């Protein structure tokens, strides 16, 4: 019933572009929309995320995240490992290389997501969330070496799995971070499950 | 260490603006970033709010409801948790319960609600608030609700059982053409991890 008309260029970045979508409306009148797009699509998404579950034994589980300064955010804020997919690599492929560049982990992958919205009423970003595993008592997890791309600093925040929520509303009140909704949003279902 | 340097406007819409972020590096170099921003945040904590609804009855099994709807960013439907954007002096609460009754028609009692949350905080400076809220599906004002739309806005309420989300969600991928919300997946996911 709706349907994109037309898209109008409005302004072009290296990174990022703002578009003019016209669309009908579900009545057959036609409408306008401001959408961003990134430049740089080829893949099934844009991005991967990676949720990192730290396996060591008599430890709890850990999941991992990352902290780093966000330019559009004007501060420091705590994500799910994450990058975006290079140009014919394979979901997976980009999952488990965004988190060794950094993690320093070298993780095994158990399932990964279609490709899923990152924010619908403003931008067409998308990414596959990967579920990967980490044998913390490997040798090969024993010092994981964070390798940084050139610009990324990145420091590496395990927190356990069981106490998600309340360890992250800490880092929030204590440090004044800003925690990614994907993090958060995980978070809450493991206090809402059963 | 890292820290705004400056914001120059590139190009500004009615909704959205696009800037180019310069920064100070943790090596103490000037780099550049480019950032999506809206035009619409003033004093909120947040530019809205997105909410977790569980809906509860006697003798069934938890629902959570989401909504689907075009989204013209995306250009196709999306399924995603009832959202909008905060009004000028409304509280994050008021703007969850009153979205939720807007998109779904169920009139909920709240939770929780998160810390401000971003999302998507490589590109943009967008940020919600997670309000979890429970729906009394026994009470007269929640057996045949109506939503009430507004002007551009044509919205279908989706409830699926908390206990099978994740499936449930790659049967509607499955049939349909549609995008699963990335807050939405990652708490389904969480749901199964627990
Ligand atoms: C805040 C949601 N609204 C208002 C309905 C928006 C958002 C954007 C990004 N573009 C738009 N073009 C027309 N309405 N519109
Ligand atoms: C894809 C991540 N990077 C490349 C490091 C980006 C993204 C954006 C939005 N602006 C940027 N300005 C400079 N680098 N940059
Ligand atoms: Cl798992
Ligand atoms: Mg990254
Ligand atoms: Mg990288
Ligand atoms: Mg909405
Ligand atoms: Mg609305």
């Not at 090969?140 to 590496?156: H, I, L």
Request: charged letters at 25%; hydrophobic letters at 35%.
């Amino acid at each position: 019933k709706q349907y994109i008309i037309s898209e109008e260029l409005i302004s072009e970045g290296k990174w990022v572009k703002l578009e003019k979508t016209t669309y009908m409306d579900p009545t057959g009148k036609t409408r306008t929309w401001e959408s961003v797009k990134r430049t740089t699509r080829k893949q099934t998404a844009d991005g991967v995320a990676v949720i990192p579950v730290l396996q060591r034994t008599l430890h709890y589980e850990c999941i991992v995240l990352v902290k780093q300064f966000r330019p559009p955010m004007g501060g420091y804020c705590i994500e799910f490992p994450a990058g975006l997919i290079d140009d014919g690599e394979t979901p997976e492929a980009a999952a488990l290389r965004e988190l060794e560049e950094e993690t320093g982990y070298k993780g095994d992958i158990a399932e990964c997501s279609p490709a899923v919205c990152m924010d619908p009423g403003l931008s067409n970003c998308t990414i596959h969330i990967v579920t990967v595993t980490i044998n913390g008592d490997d040798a090969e997890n024993a010092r994981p070496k964070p390798k940084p791309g050139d610009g990324e600093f990145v420091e590496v925040i395990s927190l356990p799995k069981n106490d998600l929520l309340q360890r992250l509303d800490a880092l929030v009140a204590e440090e004044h971070l800003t925690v990614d909704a994907r993090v958060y949003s995980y978070a809450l279902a493991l206090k809402h499950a059963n």
